[PDB]
């Protein structure tokens, strides 16, 4: 059994727009599973954004940092904090919605090969940034800010890709069959249907 999760693929999405759209859907009950939070982008040079983060990291309770604001450095933990800042995080409605979100760096093997991955066109980088303006890929800035697993994830991302690609041509004979099988299906007994398929573009 799996619940109606939708695994948003967060690569090359604007951090705060994707965080804003996702933060809304969690309220509307969607059980999202962000992945590739390493790949979230931010406007500006990395230096703009490291300094923004290092001004964040600069904030701690002097009395006892131990209980102070916590400066998570995982791009995913950074995306969860970004997305909990956009939902009623103290009411249970929002504390609940935040637990319905599961960020991951990369795309983890439990979440791969589970179903198609969604995308947020309103949060696409090309949709948002002016293309020639500089941009900060998120897992890249946070590598410089303390995240230690930036290369662990890239080694993993390399593996799922080389693996997914091997399976994409393991199945090339198969997909090629249905393409051929389906094209010759039109030639089959579906006669009057062949005209109802021509209309509508099938």
């Amino acid at each position: 059994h799996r619940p109606e999760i939708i695994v948003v693929d967060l690569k090359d999405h604007v951090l705060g727009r994707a965080a804003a759209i996702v933060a809304k859907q969690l309220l509307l009950g969607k059980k999202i599973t962000a992945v590739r939070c390493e790949q979230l982008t931010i406007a500006g040079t990395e230096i703009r954004n490291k300094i923004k983060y290092l001004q964040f990291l600069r904030k701690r309770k002097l009395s006892n940092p131990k209980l102070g604001p916590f400066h998570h450095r995982s791009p995913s933990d950074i995306f969860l904090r970004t997305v909990r800042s956009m939902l009623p995080r103290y009411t249970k409605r929002g504390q609940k919605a935040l637990r319905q979100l599961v960020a991951y760096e990369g795309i983890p093997t439990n979440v791969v090969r589970t179903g198609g991955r969604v995308v947020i066109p309103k949060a696409q980088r090309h949709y948002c940034y002016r293309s020639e303006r500089p941009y900060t890929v998120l897992g890249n800035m946070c590598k410089h800010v303390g995240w230690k697993y930036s290369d662990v994830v890239k080694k993993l991302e390399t593996a799922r890709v080389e693996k997914a690609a091997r399976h994409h041509k393991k199945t090339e004979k198969l997909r090629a069959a249905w393409k051929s099988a389906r094209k010759e299906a039109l030639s089959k007994v579906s006669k009057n249907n062949l005209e109802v398929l021509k209309k509508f573009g099938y």
């Binding site: 002097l62 009395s63 990369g106 697993y149 080694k155």
Partner: protein
């Protein structure tokens, strides 16, 4: 204004959650190296001093004998009893699994109990009967495939042999188990060292060698709810002070309107974990039965033993292999102190120095002890009344 009283990176100053002094971080793996173990549990015995000829260009002591204190650390061989693999994850290392040795010394299985001898003593009983079966042999076989595949870290699970320690004061009979990382070559190389070594003893002399340094980690000696003057080193107040002298007079200000984590306060001092660095190994020492003339240096030929005349106070004879390393070691006598391979660069002119001892000391600790030898004490006093009241009895028999 003066500097702060105390290091804030050693904080909270709380009781350690263990006592075995487990290594916090092993020195970084170097593939170029051949595989080796990175640490070794040892029991602090006591201290002595040694004479040595420093031969260090520069200083006023080059070519001159210097008396270094040394800690003696009895080191009965540890036994490997299982391998452990770690796989790197974006969230951090996960154990892949462990392969336990086909057999386990009871001292080890004592460790899984609070009352072994009133227990059914079933620990590793299913493993013993299952690792035997081909079903469980193939399962053990698969774990090693997972190591050779998914692992980044191979670690032996070794333990101390307290049975072999024969110390009368270290009351434990539960073995001191601990993973000991295998830095070395390729993971198959580490697995191979790991499994050939999977039920064998492991002497320190293999892990360490003389003049090389070792990081030590042991919980430091416990002092209970120590006061702020002993805990932090703050100045005690002038006699005329009312409420009491031994206090920080000002534990805060108006704002921030609360005591900060940085002001010193009474509480636990001692019995904290510590990793102290760069302790030179003045000698590995073989067990007294095997190599009786311990502490007999090239320049001090009398047959002798690393243990003082009264034995080590509170500990007694070092019946086993002993590491003898320069200076203090954290922890009370007879505490178990893990000591790893150095994590420092160790290319220092000092650290690389070969250490040829000129005189291990063996005088009594207890009193001043002006004799190096029980034979030499008798050679001073000669016969005395205990003997005449002994010698006479022998003649009558």
């Amino acid at each position: 204004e003066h500097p702060r009283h105390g290091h804030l990176g050693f904080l909270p100053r709380k009781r350690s959650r263990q006592i075995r002094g487990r290594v916090r971080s092993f020195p970084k793996d170097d593939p170029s190296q051949k595989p080796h173990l990175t640490s070794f549990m040892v029991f602090k015995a006591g201290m002595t001093h040694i004479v040595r000829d420093v031969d260090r260009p520069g200083s006023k002591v080059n070519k001159k004998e210097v008396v270094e204190p040394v800690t003696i650390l009895e080191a009965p061989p540890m036994v490997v009893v299982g391998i452990v693999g770690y796989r790197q994850t974006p969230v951090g290392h996960k154990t892949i699994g462990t392969v336990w040795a086909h057999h386990t010394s009871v001292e080890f299985r004592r460790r899984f109990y609070k009352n072994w001898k009133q227990s059914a003593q079933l620990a590793f009983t299913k493993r013993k009967q299952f690792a035997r079966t081909t079903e469980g042999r193939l399962a053990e076989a698969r774990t090693l495939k997972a190591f050779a595949k998914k692992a980044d870290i191979i670690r032996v699970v070794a333990h101390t042999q307290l049975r072999k320690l024969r110390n009368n004061r270290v009351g434990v009979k539960k073995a001191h188990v601990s993973e000991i990382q295998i830095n070395g070559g390729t993971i198959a190389e580490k697995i191979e060292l790991a499994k050939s070594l999977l039920e064998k003893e492991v002497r320190i002399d293999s892990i360490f060698q003389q003049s090389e340094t070792c990081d030590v980690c042991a919980v430091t000696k416990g002092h209970g709810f120590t006061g702020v003057v002993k805990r932090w080193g703050v100045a005690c107040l002038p006699r005329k002070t009312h409420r009491g002298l031994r206090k920080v007079a000002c534990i805060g200000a108006w704002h921030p309107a609360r005591v900060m984590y940085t002001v010193a306060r009474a509480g636990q001092h001692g019995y904290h974990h510590r990793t102290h660095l760069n302790k030179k190994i003045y000698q590995l020492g073989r067990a007294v039965s095997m190599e009786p003339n311990q502490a007999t240096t090239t320049y001090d030929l009398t047959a002798k033993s690393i243990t003082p005349m009264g034995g080590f106070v509170g500990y007694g004879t070092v019946r086993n292999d002993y590491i003898m390393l320069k200076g203090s070691v954290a922890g009370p006598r007879r505490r178990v102190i893990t000591l790893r391979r150095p994590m420092a660069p160790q290319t220092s002119r000092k650290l690389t120095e070969q250490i040829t001892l000129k005189f291990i000391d063996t005088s009594s600790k207890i009193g001043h002890g002006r004799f190096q030898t029980k034979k030499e004490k008798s050679q001073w006093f000669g016969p005395l009344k205990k003997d005449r009241i002994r010698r006479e009895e022998r003649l009558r028999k």
